[PDB]
């Protein structure tokens, strides 16, 4: 594990609503350079399951259109972390969030996603900041940031 | 001008030779997001005129290949600013440099592209900070940086 920064006590039946990925970051460029790079996701909402399991809804550019998914993230011992179906299993670590403006989280495989999530489409200074500090401990070398108009867009356009 | 930090005292002449082109930001993703976006441009060398002129080696991916390019930039009555001669005249500023180790400069239009320029092909935390420091200032939505490695390579494959 690269990142350990994990959120102490978190309640993940807290984090339900709706997402807006303001802010994304990887440790590769082609992870993130084009609009159908494979992790290159926007968040749409967070749907925790009765037994705690987490299952995101997101739109992801695939074949020159801006489709609907959904993923089940399976909780683990550690409840900051989810283990997610690919391939490989990968994990999903929640950083930090105050529930009601924020929440960082980061995916990992040696590749590694990070976004700052936020809940209203605005540019909220103090969560970058949070994501900014989150961030210089990783070896990041790409980083995506959108304005109130792209994140009202289906896939940021 | 929304760029309004320059170095006080350049002198253009220490600037020549050999430079890497060691992060590079812009105020919109699309400025900087595919490997032929218009001013995704890697710096090979500075090339300083007699009369106080700058002329620029770069190499940028065009139609499947990595094109070598020059470029003059004219002076003006201030040192650390230069004017290219695209469609619309558009400003290069230098932003600050210690000659011998990196070289922050930024172009601009609306539109901005910031680099972050060291001598050798290393990962420099200073000059970094330099840069991210610099820019926080500034509205830039997509940041990128190269390790080493593609430091050596043709437009840093
Ligand atoms: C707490 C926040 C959790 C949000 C989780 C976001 C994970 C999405 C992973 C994309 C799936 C990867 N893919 C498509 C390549 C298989
Ligand atoms: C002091 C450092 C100065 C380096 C100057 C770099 C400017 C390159 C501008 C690319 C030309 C834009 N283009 C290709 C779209 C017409």
């Known amino acids: 594990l690269i990142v350990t920064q994990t ?13 807006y990925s303001l ?6 460029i082609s992870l993130l350079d084009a609009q159908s790079a494979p992790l290159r996701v926007y968040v749409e909402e967070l749907k925790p399951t009765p037994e705690g399991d987490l299952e995101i809804l997101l739109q992801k550019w695939e074949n020159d259109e801006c489709a609907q998914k959904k993923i089940i993230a399976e909780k683990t011992k ?11 299993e990968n994990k999903v670590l929640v950083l ?9 989280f980061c995916m990992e495989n040696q590749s590694l996603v990070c976004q700052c999530l936020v809940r209203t489409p605005e540019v909220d200074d103090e969560a970058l900041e949070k994501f900014d500090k989150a961030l210089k401990a990783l070896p990041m070398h790409i980083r995506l940031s959108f304005n109130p108009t792209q994140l009202e867009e289906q896939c940021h356009i």
């Open 78 to 88: 550690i409840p900051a972390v989810f283990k997610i179906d690919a391939l490989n």
């Open 96 to 104: 930090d969030t105050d529930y009601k403006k924020y929440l960082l």
């Open 7 to 19: 959120m102490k006590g978190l309640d993940i039946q807290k984090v339900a609503g709706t997402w």
């Open 23 to 28: 802010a994304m970051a990887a440790s590769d």
